[PDB]
Motif scaffolding. Structure first.
Motif, PDB file in Angstrom:
ATOM      1  N   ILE A 181      -8.846  -1.156  -1.995  1.00 59.34           N
ATOM      2  CA  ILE A 181      -7.624  -1.873  -1.684  1.00 59.34           C
ATOM      3  C   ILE A 181      -7.347  -2.898  -2.837  1.00 59.34           C
ATOM      4  O   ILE A 181      -8.082  -3.898  -2.826  1.00 59.34           O
ATOM      5  CB  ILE A 181      -7.053  -2.254  -0.343  1.00 59.34           C
TER       6      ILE A 181
ATOM      7  N   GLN B  11      -1.825  -5.035   4.779  1.00 57.51           N
ATOM      8  CA  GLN B  11      -0.855  -4.350   3.696  1.00 57.51           C
ATOM      9  C   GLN B  11       0.415  -4.454   4.071  1.00 57.51           C
ATOM     10  O   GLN B  11       1.222  -4.488   2.981  1.00 57.51           O
ATOM     11  CB  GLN B  11      -1.548  -2.976   3.163  1.00 57.51           C
TER      12      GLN B  11
ATOM     13  N   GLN C  15      -9.121  -2.430   8.689  1.00 57.93           N
ATOM     14  CA  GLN C  15      -8.361  -2.336   7.495  1.00 57.93           C
ATOM     15  C   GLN C  15      -7.821  -4.053   7.380  1.00 57.93           C
ATOM     16  O   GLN C  15      -7.228  -4.511   8.129  1.00 57.93           O
ATOM     17  CB  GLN C  15      -7.427  -1.589   7.238  1.00 57.93           C
TER      18      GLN C  15
ATOM     19  N   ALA D  63       0.827  -1.110  -0.082  1.00 54.07           N
ATOM     20  CA  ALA D  63       0.014  -0.151  -0.081  1.00 54.07           C
ATOM     21  C   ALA D  63       0.807   1.343  -0.066  1.00 54.07           C
ATOM     22  O   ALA D  63       0.632   2.132   0.845  1.00 54.07           O
ATOM     23  CB  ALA D  63      -0.940   0.053   1.131  1.00 54.07           C
TER      24      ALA D  63
END
Ligand SMILES: Nc1nc2c(ncn2[C@@H]2O[C@H](COP(=O)(O)CP(=O)(O)OP(=O)(O)O)[C@@H](O)[C@H]2O)c(=O)[nH]1
Ligand SMILES: [Mg+2]
Ligand SMILES: [Zn+2]
Ligand SMILES: [Zn+2]
Ligand SMILES: [Zn+2]
Lengths: 47, 100, 176, 57, 650, 101, 57, 115, 177
Positions: free
Chosen positions: H19, H97, H94, H10
């Motif tokens: 994403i 990443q 989230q 990311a």
RNA sequence: AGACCAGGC
DNA sequence: GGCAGTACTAGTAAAGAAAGTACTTGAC
DNA sequence: GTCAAGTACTTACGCCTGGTCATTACTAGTACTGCC
């Protein structure tokens, strides 16, 4: 002082025979010192 | 057709003028350490590009050992053009030049 | 219109032709040059004649057999100037070329010059009063002003020469 | 193709072209095949012009 | 380089000339006009710096030759500068001829017979006539009739001295230019420029010209005439000036004095007979480089445009503002002054951009480097990428000391023996051992990593099994089916054997014996170079972590020089004093004191063990095919030898 | 071998009458034709110069014009070509005049 | 602005401080060793100006 | 010798976009060769032996619909000791990443090593 | 670019001439160690005669001419040369300035001639007196410097490399002055 | 491809 | 239900402790 | 014409391996939400 000798060459319209070892590496020639101080010729038998 | 014919004559008049005859040459009769290193190197490039070898190959596969063998019996068909600083030159063959 | 040029060419020489230097100039440079359009003469090279190697030292004669070739420092290939005569077939505009007719089509009357060189006469070069028939058996024949098919020979002035492609072609015209 | 091993480096016509007659062409084509046959696709075409100034197929 | 690909043409000379504006409008691929480099969606905009007519850019075919990224050489383009601007390489000489010249008769401010005195001394220095230029000076308010008689005899002496020296085998019609005539020409032009700049009145027509002022670069000013000597310009019956007017003066000065400036600007005789022009000192057209030479840097997403694109955009930004400043003048005091005071400021900023593109130290506004500063110092171009270069076929590793190596050899690791490779063309004497090498493969010493075909093609052996690889071993010595490539043969890039040559190198290479040519011997175990102790004082090499270079030469002209000429056996004596640099160092010197002592006595089994431990006839150290020994020093009671008698039979 | 052959060896093409490293370029051929090497500087525009079917070549833009086919390949370093790129941006011209002409 | 000073070492000051150097104020603690790690907290420096200097006193 | 590098998926986007790169394997025809190094999460196993060219992690890409893999860009072999799941701190929760992976390299004392 | 030419006359790459002979005698530093070690070369006469091989090296030489003019000058300089140098109108150059030392046998320097004729005068030692002076002049001629030697690199490495070993100024500040 | 920092010989 | 205030967003514009020659402006 | 300090542009061992951090303000806009 690369671009001080550069201006003095182009103002003189200066042609150089590519003799110095520093001038034969810029243009990629064999040197005129030692092994490259002569030429090699080949004897061929037929005319 | 007319300019190249004149330019070829100037290219060959000013290349005969730079040629020192065989009886008026006055450099060394010995073959220098730089002439030996280029005769063996130029011939070994030729031997590896299928030049007719004048000496017998006794199993040696190195192209530079063969040119060293050809120099021992003076069977290298090459000529040194020794340049003078004027631009003039002397033609010395390998059979004329003596080693060491 | 076969013409003679004496030329001077600067060519390489591989070490496998050190014993045969005349044979190596022919096979590497001169034999791939026959029956092709060369640009720097103006025609198609038929053959070569009288190959002479210019010797590197001028103090020897042209009568001599042993000559010198200047070896490149980087590569073992030699380089030398050589003289040879070329007999070269050059067509130009305005000439009249006797040809043998090869294509019977409604687009272009194809004809072989000297049974080797391609040529054609375009339809806009052909005048109005020369007609063409509709042959269904086989692409027919051209009825001219005399009322007869043309076959065999047809002389013509040359309009243009096609040199860029693979073989040479002669764009010809029948009007004057 | 089109290398210094194939083509000449520099090519110059040395003298002006002068036109040869029919007899020198037939003397050439009987002599250029004589040295070469004793590029075979071109020898197959050099005989077509050699059999042109003499006869007819 | 490929020894199977020759070249017939060679560069003989170079010469430095001024690239005129007429050439670079015919030279150019496409003129670029807007200061946007690349637009949205990642494409290069047509008419900008990145363009497809300037070369293939970023997986896209060219618009001039139609080639891809790997084959397009890049093409010359240009911009159209709307006004002639000052070239910063020539401004120090442009300001000499802008000064020192009359603005009324447009000669210099010297008298015309002394300008002629340098016109024909410099002609004698173009040819090899360093001595006839001083006899020319021995020729001698004043009426202008005998001055024509003075200019005649000086011009006839030159035309006779050039005719005599060219006939008497001395000087070519291309002239003679040695080193000591470069001294007399530089001494004569510096004297000529110094005397031009010091003149009060024009000695042809006697009235003053206003003196010019240069404070810094990018601008020229002329000063107003004094309040006293305006009377001289009434009896002949500060200001910023434009670069078109500076050019308009010197387009007249160089024409009224063409017969003199041909020899100031030529070291050798001008056989082209070209005119020297004031357009030499100006540049009405910038040349943009090919887009191959200004590709952007890339570090992940961090892609930045090149510094030259940042400098050529600011010229194009000013080159459109200066045209948009001509909108009101094309339509037409207050409507005229604000559009002219902003136009004159565009004249200075387009000069300050054409300086900053060429020279970064002539800029003002940490600055973006120009094209002068990619050349100047260490980390330049002459010193970082011409006199010194990064090379292929070369290794570097730590050295470890090694006996049992024959003092001219280097000990190479297996992993240097795999990677470094040598092109052997196949012949009738190679297909015994070079067929075995290509069977072994890329990872079996002695092996091969590639085969080069006759066509220039190149077949890698890495992703191949042994059944596919033995078939290529039967492909090597075959007659070529192509007539055009019938004298070429295949090259097998074999590994480095024990017969190859190696050029070793330890920094600093203070003298030439710090870079020698060693033989090779591969070693089975570890990843380090192995150097014999006689070489440790020539490279000034110790073994507390020294690493030193290994250059592997790639043709037979170079193998024959590091075996015979740059050899390590030829470098026994150094040329500094004539003293040796090679010899045993620490343990061997401490051992010969004990061995050659009087106490050292050896029996028959000991004496013959030390000889075969050092001679070993099968490796070719003896010269007799049988080890000869000596009778012992002592015969009774039992035979003993001596350490003197060790080295006697050694 | 070090400073020229195994570092930046290239066999670039040089115009013989310009002496120019980075002027000459590949011609865009026709269908069946061959792509020759040809010069940009000493080649005149076709509408400017108003021909023998072999001196005529064409760019990728469609600009067909006729001129300099006096060119050849010379072994140079590639950094010499980058030098001419920078030095012609300064307004300086280099003429690499070659010996076989 | 302190994280920029600690991660780079560069000093950004408008009322330019009494000491001469402008860069090289923070150094990565290595932890390549423990003799290395305790040596960072006892080392003294004179300045980066005194490094590129010709005298020896 | 313990070497650690951070693979982060990311650093090529901004401000609340979907994403596009997810750890793990997608539903396409990806080659089953690298089940030996990687787990079903697209993350490598603890203790496995990794030479040059082996994959460090597998991730599915949404803008290309393809499971790309990053790979181990080192000529010296190593073993994977620990894999850290660096989770992001925000109010919106989230998917991961950022992954930190530590390598160990056997430095047996060869010759040419300084003591 | 300065180097030995085939004139044995060292000069720059553009053609301008630096010296007419290298060191005044054109002999290589790496070959002149045992050149004046006459007591070493007499003890090893039959083994040094093999490596120079005098009998096979007469045909490509002029043995006869350089030896005569080397006696015209040795007899002149013993007769003259008591006066200082400004009075000496020399009338005869040494054999290096007239004869090629790489081709003419006996064309040696004057210190080599005045040290051989000083050695061989003193001590009288199956090798006679004339076979030793005929082998040193062959040892001299083979110890000539070859044309093409990068002399000025060697001359500038022989100053820059010993400079790292380092009431008036002294050392590397003196070399800068 | 630079800056600064830490090393190697 | 739609209006206007803020809080964000992505958008495109400004960023002080060494050696030598050489040119030259100062007064006279 | 000239001396004369003053102002200006130049270099300042070799190459070798690592690591780091490398645009910022702001400004106008579209959208989110509090509101009546
Ligand atoms: N050009 C350079 N060479 C170096 C440098 N450091 C070390 N060296 C080289 O490495 C060698 C290291 O020698 P030292 O500096 O340790 C002097 P030392 O007293 O330790 O010699 P010994 O006691 O005999 O080991 C030396 O011969 C130098 O040629 C350097 O900074 N520059
Ligand atoms: Mg050390
Ligand atoms: Zn292109
Ligand atoms: Zn005037
Ligand atoms: Zn051209």
């Amino acid at each position: 002082t690369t671009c001080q000798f550069l201006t003095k060459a182009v103002l003189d319209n200066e042609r150089e025979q590519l003799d110095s070892p520093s001038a034969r590496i810029v243009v990629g020639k064999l040197n005129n010192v030692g092994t490259g101080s002569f030429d090699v010729l080949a004897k061929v038998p037929n005319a | 057709p007319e300019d190249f014919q004149q330019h070829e004559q100037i290219r060959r008049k000013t290349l005969k003028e730079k040629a020192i005859p065989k009886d008026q040459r006055a450099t060394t009769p010995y073959m220098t350490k730089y002439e030996r290193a280029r005769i063996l190197g130029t011939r070994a490039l030729q031997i590896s590009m299928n030049a007719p070898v004048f000496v017998d190959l006794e199993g040696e596969t190195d192209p530079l050992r063969i040119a060293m063998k050809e120099l021992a019996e003076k069977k290298i068909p090459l000529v040194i053009r020794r340049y003078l600083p004027d631009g003039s030159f002397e033609d010395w063959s390998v059979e004329e030049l003596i080693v060491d | 219109c076969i013409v003679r040029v004496p030329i001077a060419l600067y060519v390489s020489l591989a070490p496998m032709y050190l014993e045969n230097p005349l044979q190596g100039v022919m096979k590497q440079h001169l034999n791939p040059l026959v029956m092709k359009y060369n640009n720097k003469v103006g025609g198609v090279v038929l053959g070569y004649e009288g190959l002479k190697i210019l010797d590197a030292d001028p103090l020897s004669k042209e009568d001599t057999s042993e000559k010198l070739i200047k070896i490149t420092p980087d590569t073992p290939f030699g380089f030398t100037w050589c003289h040879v005569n070329l007999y070269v077939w050059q067509p130009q505009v305005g000439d009249v070329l006797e040809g043998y007719i090869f294509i019977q089509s409604a687009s272009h009357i194809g004809l072989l010059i000297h049974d080797a060189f391609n040529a054609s006469i375009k339809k806009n070069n052909i005048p109005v009063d020369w007609t063409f028939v509709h042959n269904d058996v086989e692409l027919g024949h051209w009825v001219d002003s005399n009322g007869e098919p043309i076959d065999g020979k047809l002389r013509f002035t040359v309009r243009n020469v096609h040199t860029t492609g693979r073989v040479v072609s002669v764009d010809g015209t029948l009007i004057s | 193709t089109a290398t210094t091993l194939n083509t000449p480096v520099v090519i110059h016509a040395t003298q002006l072209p002068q036109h040869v007659s029919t007899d020198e062409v037939l003397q050439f084509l009987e002599s250029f095949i004589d040295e070469k046959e004793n590029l075979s696709s071109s020898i197959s075409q050099l005989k077509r012009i050699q059999r042109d100034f003499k006869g007819l197929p | 380089m490929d020894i199977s690909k020759p070249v017939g043409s060679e560069i003989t000379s170079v010469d430095f000339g001024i690239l005129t504006a007429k050439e670079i409008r015919n030279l150019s691929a496409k003129q670029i006009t807007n200061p946007t480099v690349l637009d949205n969606l990642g494409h290069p905009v047509s008419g900008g710096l990145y363009d497809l007519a300037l070369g293939a850019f970023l997986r896209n075919l060219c618009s001039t030759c139609g080639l891809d990224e790997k084959f397009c050489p890049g093409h010359q383009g240009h911009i159209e500068l709307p006004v002639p601007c000052y070239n910063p390489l020539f401004f120090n000489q442009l300001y000499i001829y802008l000064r020192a010249s009359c603005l009324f008769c447009h000669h210099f401010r010297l008298k015309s017979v002394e300008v002629h005195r340098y016109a024909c001394k410099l002609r004698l220095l173009q040819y090899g006539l360093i001595d006839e230029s001083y006899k020319l000076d021995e020729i001698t308010d004043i009426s202008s009739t005998l001055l024509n008689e003075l200019k005649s005899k000086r011009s006839e002496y030159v035309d006779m001295a050039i005719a005599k020296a060219l006939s008497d085998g001395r000087t070519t019609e291309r002239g003679s230019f040695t080193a000591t005539v470069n001294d007399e020409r530089k001494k004569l032009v510096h004297e000529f420029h110094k005397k031009l700049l010091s003149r009060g009145k024009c000695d042809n027509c006697g009235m003053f010209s206003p003196k010019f002022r240069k404070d810094g670069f990018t601008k020229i000013f002329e000063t107003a005439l004094n309040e006293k000597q305006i009377t001289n310009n009434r009896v002949k019956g500060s200001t910023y000036i434009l670069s078109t007017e500076v050019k308009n003066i010197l387009d007249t000065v160089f024409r009224k004095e063409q017969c003199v400036l041909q020899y100031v600007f030529h070291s050798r005789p001008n056989l082209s007979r070209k005119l020297v022009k004031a357009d030499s000192f100006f540049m009405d057209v910038l040349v943009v480089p090919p887009t191959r030479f200004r590709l952007p840097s890339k570090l992940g997403e961090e892609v930045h445009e090149n510094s030259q694109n940042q400098l050529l955009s600011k010229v194009l930004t000013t080159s459109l503002l200066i045209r948009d400043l001509n909108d009101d003048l094309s339509k037409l005091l207050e409507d005229r002054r604000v559009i002219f005071s902003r136009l004159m400021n565009a004249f200075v900023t387009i000069q300050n951009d054409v300086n900053a593109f060429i020279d970064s130290t002539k800029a003002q506004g940490v600055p973006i480097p120009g094209v002068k500063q990619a050349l100047e110092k260490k980390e330049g171009l002459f010193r970082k990428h011409m006199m010194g270069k990064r090379v292929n076929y070369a290794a570097r590793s730590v050295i470890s000391p090694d006996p049992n190596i024959e003092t001219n050899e280097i000990g190479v690791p297996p992993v240097f023996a795999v990677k470094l490779t040598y092109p052997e063309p196949v012949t009738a004497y190679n297909i015994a051992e070079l067929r075995q090498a290509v069977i072994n493969g890329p990872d079996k010493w002695p092996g091969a990593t590639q085969i080069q075909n006759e066509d220039g093609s190149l077949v890698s052996l890495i992703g191949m099994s042994v059944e596919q690889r033995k078939a290529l071993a039967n492909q090597l010595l075959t007659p070529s089916s192509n007539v055009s490539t019938h004298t070429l043969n295949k090259k097998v890039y074999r590994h480095i054997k024990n017969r190859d040559v190696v050029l070793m190198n330890r920094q600093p290479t203070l003298h030439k014996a710090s870079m020698m040519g060693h033989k090779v011997r591969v070693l089975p175990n570890e990843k380090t170079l192995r150097l014999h102790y006689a070489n440790t004082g020539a490279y000034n090499a110790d073994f507390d972590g020294d690493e030193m270079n290994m250059h592997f030469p790639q043709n037979e002209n170079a193998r024959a020089e590091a075996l015979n000429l740059a050899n390590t056996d030829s470098q026994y004596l150094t040329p500094t004093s004539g003293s040796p640099v090679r010899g045993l160092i620490q343990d061997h010197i401490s051992a010969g004191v004990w061995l050659t002592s009087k106490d050292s006595f050896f029996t028959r089994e000991q004496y013959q063990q030390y000889i075969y431990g050092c001679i070993r006839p099968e490796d070719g150290h003896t010269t007799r095919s049988k080890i000869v020994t000596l009778p012992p020093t002592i015969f009774k009671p039992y035979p003993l030898w001596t350490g003197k008698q060790i080295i006697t039979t050694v | 071998d070090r400073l020229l052959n195994s570092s930046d060896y290239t066999q670039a093409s040089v115009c013989r009458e310009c002496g120019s490293i980075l002027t000459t370029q590949q011609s865009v051929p026709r269908i069946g034709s061959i792509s020759t090497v040809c010069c940009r500087r000493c080649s005149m525009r076709f509408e400017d110069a108003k021909i023998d079917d072999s001196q005529i070549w064409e760019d990728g833009q469609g600009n067909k014009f006729v001129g300099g086919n006096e060119t050849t390949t010379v072994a140079i370093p590639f950094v010499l070509k980058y030098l001419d790129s920078e030095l012609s941006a300064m307004g300086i011209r280099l003429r690499y005049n070659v010996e076989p002409k | 602005k302190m994280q920029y000073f600690l991660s780079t070492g560069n000093l950004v000051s408008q009322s330019g401080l009494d000491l001469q150097q402008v860069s090289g104020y923070t150094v990565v603690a290595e932890k390549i060793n423990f003799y290395r790690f305790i040596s960072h907290f006892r080392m003294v420096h004179r300045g980066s100006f005194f490094a590129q200097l010709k005298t020896t006193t | 010798m313990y070497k650690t590098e951070k693979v982060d998926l990311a650093l090529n986007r901004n401000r609340g976009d979907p994403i596009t790169q997810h750890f793990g394997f997608g539903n396409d025809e990806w080659p089953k060769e690298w089940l030996e190094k990687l787990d079903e999460d697209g993350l490598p196993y603890i203790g496995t032996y990794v030479e040059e060219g082996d994959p460090i992690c597998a991730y599915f890409d949404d803008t290309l619909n393809k499971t790309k893999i990053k790979t181990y860009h080192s000529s010296e072999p190593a073993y994977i000791e620990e894999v850290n799941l660096i989770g992001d701190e925000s109010n919106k929760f989230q998917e991961l990443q950022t992954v930190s992976i530590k390598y160990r390299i056997r430095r047996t004392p060869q010759i040419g090593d300084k003591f | 670019g300065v180097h030995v030419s085939y004139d044995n006359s060292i000069r720059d790459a553009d053609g301008t001439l630096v010296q007419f002979m290298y060191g005044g005698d054109a002999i290589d530093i790496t070959k002149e160690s045992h050149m004046t070690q006459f007591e070493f070369c007499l003890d090893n006469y039959y083994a040094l005669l093999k490596k120079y091989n005098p009998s096979a090296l007469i045909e490509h030489l002029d043995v006869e001419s350089a030896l005569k003019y080397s006696k015209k000058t040795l007899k002149y300089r013993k007769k003259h040369s008591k006066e200082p140098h400004y009075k000496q109108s020399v009338k005869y150059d040494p054999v290096l300035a007239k004869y090629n030392p790489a081709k003419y046998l006996g064309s040696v320097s004057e210190n080599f001639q005045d040290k051989l004729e000083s050695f061989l005068d003193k001590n009288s030692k199956g090798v006679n007196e004339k076979k030793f002076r005929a082998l040193m002049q062959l040892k001299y001629m083979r110890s000539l410097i070859n044309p093409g030697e990068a002399v000025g690199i060697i001359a500038s490495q022989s100053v820059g490399e010993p400079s790292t070993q380092m009431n008036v100024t002294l050392g590397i500040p003196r070399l800068r002055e």
